[PDB]
Each structure stands twice: as C-alpha cells, then as structure tokens.
Amino acid sequence: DVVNHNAQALNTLVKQLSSKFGAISSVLNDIFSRLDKVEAEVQIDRLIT
Amino acid sequence: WNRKRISNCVADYSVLYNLAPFFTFKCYGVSPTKLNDLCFTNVYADSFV
Amino acid sequence: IRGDEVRQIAPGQTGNIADYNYKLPDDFTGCVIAWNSNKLDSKVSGNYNY
C-alpha cells in the first residue's frame, strides 16, 4: 500500500495536466497562438490556477 | 446555402487586411490578427448578401 | 484615417496602417478618439495631401 499510494498520486498528478479547467484548450501554446494577449492571459490564468 | 470549399490553398490574408471593403472581423475561437501563422485542414465559405 | 479602417487602431492588430504605419503596444494604457471630418479634410476633386 505504501508503494501503491505513492505511485497512484503521481499518476493522478501527471494525468491532471490534460484538464482544461474551463479554458478553451489544455495545450499551453495553442492559446498563445490562437489568441492575442488581451484574452490569452485570462484563458491561461485558469490553467495556472 | 451554397458553400464554397477551400482545400488546396495558401490562404494569404493580406487581401483581407490591406483592402478597403472590409467592415467587421467577428472571429469566434480564433484571433483574426494571428490567422496568417496557423494552418487549417479544410476551410468553408458561406458568401451571401 | 479612412473610416472603414479606423477599427485598425488597437493593441495587437494587423493591416496596412496597423503594421506599416502605426503600431500600438499590447500593454497600452490610454484612449483612442475618432470623429468624422467631412467638413475639413474632404475637399473637391480629392485632397491628396494625406
């Protein structure tokens, strides 16, 4: 259980990077490329939070 | 609903930005100012009056 | 500026005036003011000074 919990928490932390958190995309560079700096910052603030 | 299909093209938007008859650029999901940097699979046009 | 192009003045925009003539920074704090000038700038048979 000590091995499995420490593996499972790291797997969850890795898999959580595909989430959008209400933004348009989970890919960081796509928001920068598809939007200008007025709304790219407010879209990536959700990802950072 | 006569739709024009754009597949094999080099979409130069300098026509769209450097000519007089253009009024609104209402783009949803993408910024019009960065349209010359991206790529698209298939473009479709609905041109009516 | 010709009227149909007056929307080109914004932080982060492209076009003729927006690129080759007048670039605004993305962190611009200020105001942009425009009004029609048919009384003065528009002349008979074209005003070619601009």
Curated annotation (Swiss-Prot), chain A:
Q: What is this protein called?
A: Spike protein S2'
Query: What gene is behind this protein?
Result: S
Parts forming coiled coils: 1-44
Q: Which organism is it from?
A: Severe acute respiratory syndrome coronavirus 2
Q: What is the recorded phenotype of mutating residue 33 to A?
A: In strain: Alpha/B.1.1.7
Please, which domain of life does this record's source organism belong to? Viruses
Function as written in the Swiss-Prot or TrEMBL entry: Subunit of the fusion protein that is processed upon entry into the host cell. Mediates fusion of the virion and cellular membranes by functioning as a class I viral fusion protein. Contains a viral fusion peptide that is unmasked after S2 cleavage. This cleavage can occur at the cell membrane by host TMPRSS2 or during endocytosis by host CSTL. In either case, this triggers an extensive and irreversible conformational change that leads to fusion of the viral envelope with the cellular cytoplasmic membrane, releasing viral genomic RNA into the host cell cytoplasm.
